[PDB]
Short mmCIF file of all heavy atoms in Angstrom, two decimals:
data_model
loop_
_atom_site.label_atom_id
_atom_site.label_comp_id
_atom_site.label_asym_id
_atom_site.label_seq_id
_atom_site.Cartn_x
_atom_site.Cartn_y
_atom_site.Cartn_z
N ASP A 70 180.26 4.73 47.68
CA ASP A 70 180.46 3.32 47.40
C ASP A 70 179.42 2.79 46.42
O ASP A 70 179.17 1.56 46.35
CB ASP A 70 180.43 2.49 48.73
CG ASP A 70 179.07 2.48 49.39
OD1 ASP A 70 178.18 3.28 49.02
OD2 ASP A 70 178.87 1.68 50.30
N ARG A 87 184.28 -3.27 48.62
CA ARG A 87 184.25 -1.83 48.34
C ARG A 87 184.41 -0.95 49.62
O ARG A 87 183.69 -1.09 50.58
CB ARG A 87 182.86 -1.51 47.73
CG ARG A 87 182.84 -0.35 46.75
CD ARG A 87 181.48 -0.24 46.05
NE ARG A 87 181.40 -1.10 44.89
CZ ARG A 87 180.31 -1.22 44.14
NH1 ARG A 87 179.21 -0.55 44.48
NH2 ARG A 87 180.32 -2.05 43.08
N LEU A 88 185.34 -0.01 49.58
CA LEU A 88 185.53 0.93 50.68
C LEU A 88 184.29 1.80 50.96
O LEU A 88 183.79 2.47 50.05
CB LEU A 88 186.69 1.86 50.37
CG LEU A 88 187.04 2.93 51.44
CD1 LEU A 88 187.46 2.25 52.75
CD2 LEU A 88 188.20 3.79 50.86
N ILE A 89 183.82 1.77 52.21
CA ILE A 89 182.72 2.59 52.59
C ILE A 89 183.08 3.71 53.55
O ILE A 89 182.59 4.85 53.40
CB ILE A 89 181.51 1.76 53.10
CG1 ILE A 89 180.35 2.72 53.45
CG2 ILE A 89 181.85 0.88 54.28
CD1 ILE A 89 179.09 1.93 53.81
N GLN A 90 184.05 3.47 54.45
CA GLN A 90 184.47 4.50 55.37
C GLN A 90 185.76 4.14 56.03
O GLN A 90 186.09 2.96 56.05
CB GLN A 90 183.44 4.72 56.48
CG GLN A 90 183.03 3.53 57.33
CD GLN A 90 183.51 3.64 58.75
OE1 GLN A 90 182.75 3.48 59.68
NE2 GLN A 90 184.76 3.83 58.94
N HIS A 92 187.95 5.09 59.90
CA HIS A 92 187.93 5.81 61.16
C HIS A 92 189.13 5.31 61.95
O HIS A 92 189.81 4.34 61.53
CB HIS A 92 186.65 5.47 61.95
CG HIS A 92 186.50 4.00 62.24
ND1 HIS A 92 185.86 3.13 61.38
CD2 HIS A 92 186.92 3.26 63.28
CE1 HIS A 92 185.88 1.92 61.90
NE2 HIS A 92 186.54 1.96 63.04
N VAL A 119 187.05 0.34 56.21
CA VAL A 119 186.00 -0.67 56.28
C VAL A 119 185.47 -0.90 54.84
O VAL A 119 185.15 0.07 54.14
CB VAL A 119 184.84 -0.22 57.25
CG1 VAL A 119 183.71 -1.27 57.30
CG2 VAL A 119 185.35 0.09 58.67
N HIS A 120 185.35 -2.15 54.41
CA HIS A 120 184.91 -2.43 53.04
C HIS A 120 183.79 -3.49 53.10
O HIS A 120 183.88 -4.40 53.90
CB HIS A 120 186.04 -3.02 52.14
CG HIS A 120 187.34 -2.27 52.18
ND1 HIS A 120 188.15 -2.25 53.31
CD2 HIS A 120 187.96 -1.50 51.26
CE1 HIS A 120 189.21 -1.50 53.07
NE2 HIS A 120 189.13 -1.04 51.83
N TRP A 121 182.82 -3.42 52.19
CA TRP A 121 181.82 -4.50 52.07
C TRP A 121 181.87 -5.29 50.76
O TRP A 121 182.25 -4.75 49.68
CB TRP A 121 180.39 -3.95 52.30
CG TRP A 121 180.06 -2.81 51.42
CD1 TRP A 121 180.32 -1.47 51.64
CD2 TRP A 121 179.39 -2.90 50.15
NE1 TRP A 121 179.90 -0.73 50.57
CE2 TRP A 121 179.27 -1.58 49.66
CE3 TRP A 121 178.86 -3.97 49.40
CZ2 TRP A 121 178.66 -1.29 48.42
CZ3 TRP A 121 178.23 -3.69 48.17
CH2 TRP A 121 178.15 -2.35 47.70
N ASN A 122 181.51 -6.57 50.88
CA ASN A 122 181.61 -7.59 49.83
C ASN A 122 180.55 -7.29 48.76
O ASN A 122 179.34 -7.37 49.04
CB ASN A 122 181.39 -9.00 50.44
CG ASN A 122 181.82 -10.14 49.51
OD1 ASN A 122 181.67 -10.01 48.31
ND2 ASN A 122 182.38 -11.26 50.08
N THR A 123 181.00 -6.99 47.55
CA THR A 123 180.12 -6.37 46.52
C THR A 123 179.28 -7.48 45.96
O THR A 123 178.15 -7.25 45.58
CB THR A 123 180.87 -5.81 45.29
OG1 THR A 123 181.64 -6.86 44.69
CG2 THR A 123 181.78 -4.66 45.66
N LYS A 124 179.34 -8.95 46.53
CA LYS A 124 178.36 -9.83 46.04
C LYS A 124 177.03 -9.68 46.79
O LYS A 124 176.05 -10.29 46.36
CB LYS A 124 178.88 -11.25 46.10
CG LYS A 124 178.93 -11.89 47.48
CD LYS A 124 179.49 -13.27 47.20
CE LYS A 124 179.91 -13.99 48.43
NZ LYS A 124 179.59 -15.41 48.13
N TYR A 125 177.00 -8.88 47.87
CA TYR A 125 175.80 -8.71 48.64
C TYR A 125 175.04 -7.42 48.40
O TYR A 125 174.08 -7.13 49.12
CB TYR A 125 176.08 -8.93 50.12
CG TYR A 125 176.74 -10.25 50.41
CD1 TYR A 125 177.95 -10.31 51.13
CD2 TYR A 125 176.13 -11.46 50.05
CE1 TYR A 125 178.55 -11.53 51.45
CE2 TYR A 125 176.70 -12.68 50.39
CZ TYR A 125 177.91 -12.72 51.07
OH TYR A 125 178.48 -13.94 51.37
N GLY A 126 175.47 -6.65 47.42
CA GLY A 126 174.65 -5.55 46.93
C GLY A 126 174.86 -4.25 47.68
O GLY A 126 175.01 -3.21 47.06
N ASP A 127 174.79 -4.29 49.02
CA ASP A 127 175.19 -3.08 49.75
C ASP A 127 175.60 -3.42 51.17
O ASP A 127 175.64 -4.58 51.52
CB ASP A 127 174.12 -1.98 49.67
CG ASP A 127 172.87 -2.34 50.40
OD1 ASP A 127 172.85 -3.41 51.03
OD2 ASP A 127 171.92 -1.54 50.36
N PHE A 128 175.98 -2.41 51.94
CA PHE A 128 176.51 -2.67 53.30
C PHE A 128 175.52 -3.40 54.24
O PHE A 128 175.90 -4.32 54.95
CB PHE A 128 176.98 -1.34 53.92
CG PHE A 128 177.52 -1.47 55.34
CD1 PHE A 128 178.89 -1.61 55.55
CD2 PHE A 128 176.70 -1.39 56.42
CE1 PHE A 128 179.41 -1.67 56.84
CE2 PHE A 128 177.19 -1.47 57.72
CZ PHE A 128 178.57 -1.61 57.94
N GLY A 129 174.26 -2.95 54.26
CA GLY A 129 173.30 -3.50 55.23
C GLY A 129 173.09 -4.99 54.99
O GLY A 129 172.93 -5.75 55.91
N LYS A 130 173.09 -5.41 53.74
CA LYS A 130 172.96 -6.82 53.46
C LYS A 130 174.27 -7.54 53.75
O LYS A 130 174.22 -8.67 54.25
CB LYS A 130 172.51 -7.05 51.99
CG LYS A 130 172.11 -8.50 51.69
CD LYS A 130 170.87 -8.96 52.48
CE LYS A 130 169.55 -8.62 51.81
NZ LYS A 130 168.55 -7.99 52.73
N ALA A 131 175.41 -6.91 53.42
CA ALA A 131 176.78 -7.51 53.69
C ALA A 131 176.95 -7.92 55.16
O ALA A 131 177.44 -9.02 55.48
CB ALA A 131 177.89 -6.53 53.25
N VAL A 132 176.45 -7.09 56.07
CA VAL A 132 176.56 -7.32 57.55
C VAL A 132 175.57 -8.38 58.09
O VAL A 132 175.46 -8.57 59.27
CB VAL A 132 176.50 -5.99 58.39
CG1 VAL A 132 177.62 -5.08 57.97
CG2 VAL A 132 175.14 -5.27 58.30
N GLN A 133 174.85 -9.04 57.20
CA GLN A 133 174.07 -10.22 57.52
C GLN A 133 174.85 -11.46 57.08
O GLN A 133 174.34 -12.61 57.23
CB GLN A 133 172.70 -10.12 56.82
CG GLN A 133 171.88 -8.98 57.47
CD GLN A 133 170.49 -8.83 56.85
OE1 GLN A 133 169.70 -9.76 56.84
NE2 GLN A 133 170.19 -7.65 56.34
N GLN A 134 176.10 -11.26 56.60
CA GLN A 134 176.88 -12.42 56.03
C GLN A 134 178.18 -12.63 56.81
O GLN A 134 178.80 -11.65 57.20
CB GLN A 134 177.19 -12.23 54.53
CG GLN A 134 176.05 -11.63 53.73
CD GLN A 134 174.78 -12.45 53.78
OE1 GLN A 134 174.82 -13.68 53.89
NE2 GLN A 134 173.61 -11.74 53.69
N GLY A 137 180.78 -10.76 54.87
CA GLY A 137 180.28 -9.56 54.33
C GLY A 137 181.26 -8.43 54.34
O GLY A 137 181.10 -7.49 53.55
N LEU A 138 182.21 -8.44 55.30
CA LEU A 138 183.11 -7.25 55.45
C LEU A 138 184.58 -7.62 55.41
O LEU A 138 184.96 -8.73 55.81
CB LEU A 138 182.83 -6.51 56.75
CG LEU A 138 181.39 -5.97 56.93
CD1 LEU A 138 181.34 -5.21 58.26
CD2 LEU A 138 180.98 -4.97 55.85
N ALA A 139 185.39 -6.64 55.02
CA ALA A 139 186.87 -6.76 55.15
C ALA A 139 187.35 -5.45 55.75
O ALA A 139 186.97 -4.36 55.28
CB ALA A 139 187.57 -7.04 53.77
N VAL A 140 188.11 -5.53 56.84
CA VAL A 140 188.60 -4.29 57.40
C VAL A 140 190.14 -4.39 57.34
O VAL A 140 190.73 -5.38 57.80
CB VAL A 140 188.17 -4.04 58.84
CG1 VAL A 140 188.76 -2.68 59.35
CG2 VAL A 140 186.63 -4.05 58.95
N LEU A 195 183.26 -6.43 63.75
CA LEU A 195 183.42 -5.00 64.02
C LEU A 195 183.72 -4.81 65.53
O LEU A 195 183.27 -5.60 66.38
CB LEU A 195 182.17 -4.22 63.63
CG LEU A 195 181.91 -4.18 62.12
CD1 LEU A 195 180.62 -3.50 61.76
CD2 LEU A 195 183.06 -3.49 61.46
N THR A 197 182.99 -2.08 67.36
CA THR A 197 181.99 -1.22 68.05
C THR A 197 180.64 -1.88 67.97
O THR A 197 180.37 -2.62 67.00
CB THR A 197 181.91 0.17 67.39
OG1 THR A 197 181.71 0.01 65.97
CG2 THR A 197 183.24 0.94 67.63
N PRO A 199 177.17 -2.76 66.73
CA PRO A 199 176.61 -3.97 67.34
C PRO A 199 177.55 -5.15 67.15
O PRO A 199 177.13 -6.28 67.30
CB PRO A 199 175.28 -4.18 66.57
CG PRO A 199 175.45 -3.51 65.27
CD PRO A 199 176.40 -2.32 65.54
N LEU A 201 179.22 -6.91 64.95
CA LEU A 201 178.74 -7.96 64.09
C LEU A 201 179.91 -8.82 63.57
O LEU A 201 180.95 -8.28 63.17
CB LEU A 201 177.90 -7.37 62.94
CG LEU A 201 176.66 -6.54 63.33
CD1 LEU A 201 176.05 -6.05 62.03
CD2 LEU A 201 175.61 -7.30 64.12
N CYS A 203 181.19 -10.35 61.01
CA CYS A 203 181.13 -10.37 59.52
C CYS A 203 182.50 -10.09 58.90
O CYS A 203 182.57 -9.96 57.68
CB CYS A 203 180.20 -9.25 58.98
SG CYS A 203 178.63 -9.09 59.84
N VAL A 204 183.56 -9.92 59.72
CA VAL A 204 184.79 -9.27 59.19
C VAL A 204 185.93 -10.24 58.93
O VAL A 204 186.29 -11.02 59.78
CB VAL A 204 185.37 -8.19 60.17
CG1 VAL A 204 186.64 -7.55 59.54
CG2 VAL A 204 184.31 -7.14 60.58
#
Side-chain angles (χ1 to χ4, degrees):
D70 67 346
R87 211 172 274 177
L88 180 62
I89 182 174
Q90 56 112 130
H92 58 271
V119 179
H120 311 69
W121 54 274
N122 194 326
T123 57
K124 74 181 168 145
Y125 305 125
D127 68 3
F128 179 95
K130 190 64 87 227
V132 301
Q133 292 181 57
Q134 320 301 329
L138 300 182
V140 180
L195 292 176
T197 52
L201 301 179
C203 315
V204 180

